[PDB]
Tab-separated table of C-alpha atoms in Angstrom:
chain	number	residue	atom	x	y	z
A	33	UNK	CA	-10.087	23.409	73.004
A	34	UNK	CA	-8.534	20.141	71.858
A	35	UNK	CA	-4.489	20.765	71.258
A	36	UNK	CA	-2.474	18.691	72.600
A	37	UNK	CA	0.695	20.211	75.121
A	38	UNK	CA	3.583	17.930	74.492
A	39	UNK	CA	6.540	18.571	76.958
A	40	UNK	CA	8.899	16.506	79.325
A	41	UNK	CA	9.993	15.768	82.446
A	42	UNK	CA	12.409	18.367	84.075
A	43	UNK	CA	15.246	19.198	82.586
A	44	UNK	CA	15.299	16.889	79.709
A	45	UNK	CA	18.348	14.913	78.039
A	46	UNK	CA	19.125	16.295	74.506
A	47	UNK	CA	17.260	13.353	73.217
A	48	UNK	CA	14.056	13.884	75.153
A	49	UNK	CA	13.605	17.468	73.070
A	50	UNK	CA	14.553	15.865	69.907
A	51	UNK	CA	11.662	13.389	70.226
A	52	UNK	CA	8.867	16.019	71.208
A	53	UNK	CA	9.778	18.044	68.687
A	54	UNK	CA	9.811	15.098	66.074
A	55	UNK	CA	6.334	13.808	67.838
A	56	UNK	CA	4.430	17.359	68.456
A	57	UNK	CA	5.158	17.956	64.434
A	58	UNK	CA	3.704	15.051	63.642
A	59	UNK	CA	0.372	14.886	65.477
A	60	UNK	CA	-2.315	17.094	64.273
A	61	UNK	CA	-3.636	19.355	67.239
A	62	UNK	CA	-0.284	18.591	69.083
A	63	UNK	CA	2.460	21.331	70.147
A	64	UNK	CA	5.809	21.142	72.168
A	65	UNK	CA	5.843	22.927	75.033
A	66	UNK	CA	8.794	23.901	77.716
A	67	UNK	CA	8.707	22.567	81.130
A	68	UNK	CA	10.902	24.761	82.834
A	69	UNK	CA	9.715	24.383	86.452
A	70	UNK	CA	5.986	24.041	86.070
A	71	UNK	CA	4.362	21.881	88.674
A	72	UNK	CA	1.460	19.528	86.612
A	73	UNK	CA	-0.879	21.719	87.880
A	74	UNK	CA	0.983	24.335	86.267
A	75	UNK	CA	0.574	22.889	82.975
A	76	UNK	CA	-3.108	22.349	83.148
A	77	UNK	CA	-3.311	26.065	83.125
A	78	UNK	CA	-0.674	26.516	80.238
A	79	UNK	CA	-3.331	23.955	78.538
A	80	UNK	CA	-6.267	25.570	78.861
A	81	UNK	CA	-4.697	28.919	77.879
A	82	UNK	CA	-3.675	27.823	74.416
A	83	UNK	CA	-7.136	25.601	74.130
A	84	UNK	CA	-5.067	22.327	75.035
A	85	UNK	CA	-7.288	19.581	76.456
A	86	UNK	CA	-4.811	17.045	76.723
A	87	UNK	CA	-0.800	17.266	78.330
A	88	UNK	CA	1.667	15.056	77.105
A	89	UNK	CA	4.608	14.532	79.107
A	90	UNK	CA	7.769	11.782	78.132
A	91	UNK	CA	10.191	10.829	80.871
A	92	UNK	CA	13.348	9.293	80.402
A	93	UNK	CA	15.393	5.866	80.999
A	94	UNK	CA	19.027	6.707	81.213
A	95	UNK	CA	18.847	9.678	78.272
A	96	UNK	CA	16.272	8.009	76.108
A	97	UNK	CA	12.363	8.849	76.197
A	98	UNK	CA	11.146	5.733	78.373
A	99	UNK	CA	7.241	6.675	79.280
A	100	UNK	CA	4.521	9.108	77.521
A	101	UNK	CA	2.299	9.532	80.243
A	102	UNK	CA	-1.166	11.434	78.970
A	103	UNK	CA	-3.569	13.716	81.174
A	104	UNK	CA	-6.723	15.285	80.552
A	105	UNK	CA	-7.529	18.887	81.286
A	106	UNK	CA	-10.605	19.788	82.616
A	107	UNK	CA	-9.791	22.373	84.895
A	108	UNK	CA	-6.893	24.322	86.600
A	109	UNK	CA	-6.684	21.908	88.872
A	110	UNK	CA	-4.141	19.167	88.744
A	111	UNK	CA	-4.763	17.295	85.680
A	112	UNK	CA	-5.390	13.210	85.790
A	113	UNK	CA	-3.523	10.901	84.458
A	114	UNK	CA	-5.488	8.929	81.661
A	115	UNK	CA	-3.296	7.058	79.547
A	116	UNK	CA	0.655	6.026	79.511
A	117	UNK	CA	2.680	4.110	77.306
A	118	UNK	CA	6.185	2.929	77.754
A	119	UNK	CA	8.500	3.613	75.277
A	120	UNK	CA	10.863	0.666	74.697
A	121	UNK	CA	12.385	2.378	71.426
A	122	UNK	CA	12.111	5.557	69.230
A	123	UNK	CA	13.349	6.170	66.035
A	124	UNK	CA	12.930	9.944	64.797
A	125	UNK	CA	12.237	10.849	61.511
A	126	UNK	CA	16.207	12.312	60.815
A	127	UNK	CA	17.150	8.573	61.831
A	128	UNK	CA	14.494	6.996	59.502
A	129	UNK	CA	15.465	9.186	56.346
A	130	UNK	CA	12.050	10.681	55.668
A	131	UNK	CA	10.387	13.570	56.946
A	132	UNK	CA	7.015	15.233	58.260
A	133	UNK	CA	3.647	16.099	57.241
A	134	UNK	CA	2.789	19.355	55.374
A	135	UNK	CA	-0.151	20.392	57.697
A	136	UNK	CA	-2.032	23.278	57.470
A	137	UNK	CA	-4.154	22.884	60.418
A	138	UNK	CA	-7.875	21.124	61.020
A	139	UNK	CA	-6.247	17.476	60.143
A	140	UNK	CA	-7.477	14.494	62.709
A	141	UNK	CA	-5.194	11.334	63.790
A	142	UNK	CA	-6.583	8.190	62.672
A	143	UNK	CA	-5.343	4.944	64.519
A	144	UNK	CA	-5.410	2.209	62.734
A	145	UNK	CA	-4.345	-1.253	64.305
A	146	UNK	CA	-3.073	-3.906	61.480
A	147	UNK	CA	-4.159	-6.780	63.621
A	148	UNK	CA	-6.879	-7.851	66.311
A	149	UNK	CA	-4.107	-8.163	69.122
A	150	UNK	CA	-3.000	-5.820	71.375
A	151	UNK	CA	-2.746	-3.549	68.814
A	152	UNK	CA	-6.337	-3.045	69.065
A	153	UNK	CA	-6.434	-2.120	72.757
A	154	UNK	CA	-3.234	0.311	71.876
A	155	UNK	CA	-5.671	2.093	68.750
A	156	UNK	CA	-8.440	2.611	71.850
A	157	UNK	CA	-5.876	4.075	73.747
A	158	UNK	CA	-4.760	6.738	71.093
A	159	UNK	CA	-8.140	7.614	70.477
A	160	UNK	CA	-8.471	8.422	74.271
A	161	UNK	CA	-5.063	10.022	74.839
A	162	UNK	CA	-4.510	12.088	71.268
A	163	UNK	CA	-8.539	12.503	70.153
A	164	UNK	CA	-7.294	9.676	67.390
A	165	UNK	CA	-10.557	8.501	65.542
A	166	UNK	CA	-11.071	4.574	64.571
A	167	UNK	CA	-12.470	5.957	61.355
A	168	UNK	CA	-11.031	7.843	58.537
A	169	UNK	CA	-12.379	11.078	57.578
A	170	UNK	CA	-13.967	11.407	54.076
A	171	UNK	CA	-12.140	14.465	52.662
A	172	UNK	CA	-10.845	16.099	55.552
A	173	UNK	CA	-6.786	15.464	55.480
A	174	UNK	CA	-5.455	13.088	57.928
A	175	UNK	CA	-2.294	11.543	59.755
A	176	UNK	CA	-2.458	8.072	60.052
A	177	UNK	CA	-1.035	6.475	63.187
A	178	UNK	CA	-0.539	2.635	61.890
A	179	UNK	CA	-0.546	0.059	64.992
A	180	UNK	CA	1.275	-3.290	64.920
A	181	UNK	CA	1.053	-5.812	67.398
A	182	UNK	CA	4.753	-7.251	67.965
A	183	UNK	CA	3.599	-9.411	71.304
A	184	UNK	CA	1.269	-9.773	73.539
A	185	UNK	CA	2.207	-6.296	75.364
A	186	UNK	CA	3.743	-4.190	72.877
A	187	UNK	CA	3.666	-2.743	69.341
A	188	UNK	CA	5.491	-0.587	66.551
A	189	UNK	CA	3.556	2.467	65.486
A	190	UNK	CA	4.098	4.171	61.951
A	191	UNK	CA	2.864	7.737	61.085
A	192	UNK	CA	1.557	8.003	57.843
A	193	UNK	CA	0.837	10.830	55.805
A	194	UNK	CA	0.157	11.630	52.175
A	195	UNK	CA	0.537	7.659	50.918
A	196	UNK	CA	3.919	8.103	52.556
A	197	UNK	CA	5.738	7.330	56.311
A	198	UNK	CA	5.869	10.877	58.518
A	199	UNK	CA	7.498	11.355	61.964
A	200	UNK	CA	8.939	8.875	64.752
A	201	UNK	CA	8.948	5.034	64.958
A	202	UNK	CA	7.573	3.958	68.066
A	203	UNK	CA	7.806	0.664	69.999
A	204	UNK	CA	5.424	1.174	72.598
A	205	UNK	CA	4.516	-1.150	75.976
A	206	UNK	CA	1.786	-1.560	78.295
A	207	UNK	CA	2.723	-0.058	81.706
A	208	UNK	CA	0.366	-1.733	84.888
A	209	UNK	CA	-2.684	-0.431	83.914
A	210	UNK	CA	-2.515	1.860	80.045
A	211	UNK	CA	-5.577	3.291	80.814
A	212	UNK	CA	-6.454	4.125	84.069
Protein backbone atom coordinates (compact mmCIF):
# COMPACT_ATOMS: atom_id res chain seq x y z
CA UNK A 1 0.00 0.00 0.00
CA UNK A 2 0.92 3.68 -0.22
CA UNK A 3 -1.64 5.80 2.24
CA UNK A 4 -0.33 7.87 4.28
CA UNK A 5 -1.34 7.57 8.48
CA UNK A 6 -1.40 11.10 9.69
CA UNK A 7 -1.73 11.32 13.58
CA UNK A 8 0.01 13.16 16.58
CA UNK A 9 1.82 13.02 19.44
CA UNK A 10 -0.11 11.89 22.64
CA UNK A 11 -2.78 13.54 23.67
CA UNK A 12 -2.86 16.39 21.33
CA UNK A 13 -3.80 20.23 21.96
CA UNK A 14 -7.12 21.15 20.20
CA UNK A 15 -5.00 22.70 17.57
CA UNK A 16 -2.84 19.69 16.81
CA UNK A 17 -6.31 17.75 15.54
CA UNK A 18 -7.44 20.74 13.72
CA UNK A 19 -4.27 20.70 11.59
CA UNK A 20 -4.29 16.83 10.74
CA UNK A 21 -7.53 16.96 9.88
CA UNK A 22 -7.01 20.15 7.62
CA UNK A 23 -3.57 18.34 6.28
CA UNK A 24 -4.83 14.48 5.92
CA UNK A 25 -7.87 16.13 3.66
CA UNK A 26 -5.67 17.68 1.67
CA UNK A 27 -3.04 15.13 0.65
CA UNK A 28 -4.07 12.53 -1.74
CA UNK A 29 -3.35 8.95 -0.22
CA UNK A 30 -3.24 10.65 3.29
CA UNK A 31 -5.74 9.84 6.34
CA UNK A 32 -5.93 11.06 10.06
CA UNK A 33 -5.54 8.63 12.37
CA UNK A 34 -5.97 8.52 16.45
CA UNK A 35 -3.06 8.01 18.61
CA UNK A 36 -4.57 7.01 21.66
CA UNK A 37 -1.71 5.11 23.34
CA UNK A 38 -0.05 3.37 20.45
CA UNK A 39 3.65 2.89 20.85
CA UNK A 40 5.38 3.75 17.05
CA UNK A 41 5.62 0.33 16.65
CA UNK A 42 2.07 0.21 17.18
CA UNK A 43 1.36 2.36 14.35
CA UNK A 44 3.46 0.56 11.85
CA UNK A 45 0.97 -2.18 12.24
CA UNK A 46 -2.16 0.21 12.08
CA UNK A 47 -0.19 1.20 8.66
CA UNK A 48 0.17 -1.76 7.10
CA UNK A 49 -3.39 -2.83 7.98
CA UNK A 50 -5.07 -0.04 6.07
CA UNK A 51 -2.17 -0.33 3.15
CA UNK A 52 -0.30 2.80 4.75
CA UNK A 53 3.39 2.89 3.82
CA UNK A 54 4.20 5.99 5.35
CA UNK A 55 3.20 7.47 9.29
CA UNK A 56 2.93 10.96 9.80
CA UNK A 57 3.14 12.19 13.18
CA UNK A 58 3.09 16.35 14.27
CA UNK A 59 4.25 17.28 17.74
CA UNK A 60 3.65 20.37 19.37
CA UNK A 61 5.45 23.72 20.70
CA UNK A 62 3.39 25.12 23.48
CA UNK A 63 -0.27 24.13 21.71
CA UNK A 64 0.78 24.73 18.16
CA UNK A 65 1.98 21.85 15.64
CA UNK A 66 5.92 22.47 15.89
CA UNK A 67 7.51 19.19 13.97
CA UNK A 68 6.02 16.63 11.20
CA UNK A 69 8.27 13.93 11.66
CA UNK A 70 7.75 11.13 8.64
CA UNK A 71 8.50 7.23 8.87
CA UNK A 72 8.45 4.56 6.48
CA UNK A 73 6.74 1.25 6.97
CA UNK A 74 8.24 -1.70 5.92
CA UNK A 75 7.39 -4.00 8.48
CA UNK A 76 5.75 -4.43 11.97
CA UNK A 77 8.62 -3.54 13.37
CA UNK A 78 9.32 -0.09 14.64
CA UNK A 79 9.13 2.15 11.76
CA UNK A 80 12.30 4.64 10.81
CA UNK A 81 12.30 7.89 10.82
CA UNK A 82 12.93 9.32 7.19
CA UNK A 83 12.05 12.77 6.94
CA UNK A 84 10.99 15.78 9.49
CA UNK A 85 10.16 19.20 9.05
CA UNK A 86 9.69 21.86 11.61
CA UNK A 87 6.77 23.73 11.56
CA UNK A 88 7.44 27.41 12.35
CA UNK A 89 3.71 28.42 11.33
CA UNK A 90 0.37 26.92 10.05
CA UNK A 91 -2.42 28.51 8.73
CA UNK A 92 -5.56 26.11 8.12
CA UNK A 93 -7.76 26.43 5.44
CA UNK A 94 -10.92 27.95 7.91
CA UNK A 95 -8.17 30.72 8.73
CA UNK A 96 -7.24 31.28 5.02
CA UNK A 97 -10.99 31.59 3.77
CA UNK A 98 -10.90 28.85 1.15
CA UNK A 99 -11.43 25.32 1.33
CA UNK A 100 -10.34 21.67 0.17
CA UNK A 101 -10.04 19.55 -2.75
CA UNK A 102 -12.98 17.52 -4.19
CA UNK A 103 -11.07 14.15 -4.42
CA UNK A 104 -12.36 11.12 -5.46
CA UNK A 105 -9.46 8.97 -4.89
CA UNK A 106 -6.26 7.83 -7.30
CA UNK A 107 -4.96 11.71 -7.32
CA UNK A 108 -0.89 12.06 -6.79
CA UNK A 109 0.91 15.16 -4.91
CA UNK A 110 3.05 17.05 -7.12
CA UNK A 111 5.80 19.30 -5.43
CA UNK A 112 6.70 21.93 -7.14
CA UNK A 113 9.52 24.34 -5.80
CA UNK A 114 9.18 28.12 -7.30
CA UNK A 115 12.87 28.65 -6.96
CA UNK A 116 16.35 26.74 -7.09
CA UNK A 117 16.95 27.39 -3.23
CA UNK A 118 16.13 25.43 -0.52
CA UNK A 119 12.98 25.03 -1.83
CA UNK A 120 14.37 22.51 -4.06
CA UNK A 121 15.88 20.27 -1.38
CA UNK A 122 12.29 20.75 0.56
CA UNK A 123 10.34 19.38 -3.07
CA UNK A 124 12.98 16.15 -2.72
CA UNK A 125 11.92 15.80 0.61
CA UNK A 126 8.07 15.65 -0.11
CA UNK A 127 8.61 13.34 -2.75
CA UNK A 128 10.37 11.02 -0.17
CA UNK A 129 8.08 11.60 2.82
CA UNK A 130 4.37 11.93 0.97
CA UNK A 131 5.22 9.79 -2.54
CA UNK A 132 5.04 13.64 -4.05
CA UNK A 133 6.23 13.37 -7.79
CA UNK A 134 8.62 16.25 -9.40
CA UNK A 135 6.44 15.80 -12.44
CA UNK A 136 2.89 16.45 -13.17
CA UNK A 137 0.70 13.79 -14.31
CA UNK A 138 -0.83 14.09 -17.84
CA UNK A 139 -4.56 13.55 -17.13
CA UNK A 140 -4.61 11.94 -13.95
CA UNK A 141 -6.00 14.75 -11.29
CA UNK A 142 -3.55 16.18 -8.99
CA UNK A 143 -2.83 18.34 -5.73
CA UNK A 144 -0.19 20.58 -6.14
CA UNK A 145 2.08 21.23 -3.17
CA UNK A 146 3.77 24.77 -4.31
CA UNK A 147 7.33 25.31 -2.49
CA UNK A 148 8.80 28.75 -1.78
CA UNK A 149 12.06 29.39 -0.54
CA UNK A 150 11.75 32.29 2.21
CA UNK A 151 15.66 31.78 3.46
CA UNK A 152 18.22 29.78 3.38
CA UNK A 153 16.45 27.10 5.83
CA UNK A 154 12.89 27.52 5.43
CA UNK A 155 9.90 27.91 3.09
CA UNK A 156 6.01 28.58 2.69
CA UNK A 157 4.14 25.75 1.04
CA UNK A 158 0.70 26.31 -0.84
CA UNK A 159 -1.71 23.44 -1.79
CA UNK A 160 -3.18 23.84 -4.95
CA UNK A 161 -5.98 22.26 -6.47
CA UNK A 162 -8.31 22.81 -9.40
CA UNK A 163 -6.46 26.36 -10.60
CA UNK A 164 -7.32 27.30 -7.04
CA UNK A 165 -5.44 27.34 -3.24
CA UNK A 166 -6.68 23.99 -1.07
CA UNK A 167 -5.75 23.17 2.57
CA UNK A 168 -3.08 24.60 5.17
CA UNK A 169 -0.31 27.24 4.77
CA UNK A 170 2.82 25.93 5.86
CA UNK A 171 6.10 27.60 6.91
CA UNK A 172 8.28 24.80 7.18
CA UNK A 173 12.22 24.53 8.61
CA UNK A 174 15.04 22.30 8.30
CA UNK A 175 15.54 20.36 11.59
CA UNK A 176 19.56 18.89 11.97
CA UNK A 177 19.45 16.62 9.36
CA UNK A 178 15.58 16.69 7.07
CA UNK A 179 16.38 13.61 5.71
CA UNK A 180 18.06 11.17 7.53
Amino acid sequence: GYRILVTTSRRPSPRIRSFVKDLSATIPGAFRFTRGHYSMEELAREAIIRGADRIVVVGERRGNPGIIRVYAVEGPERPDNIVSFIVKGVSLSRERRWGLPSLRGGEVLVARPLDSGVAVEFADAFVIAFHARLKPPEAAGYVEAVIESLDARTVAVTFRYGGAPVGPMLRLGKPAEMVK
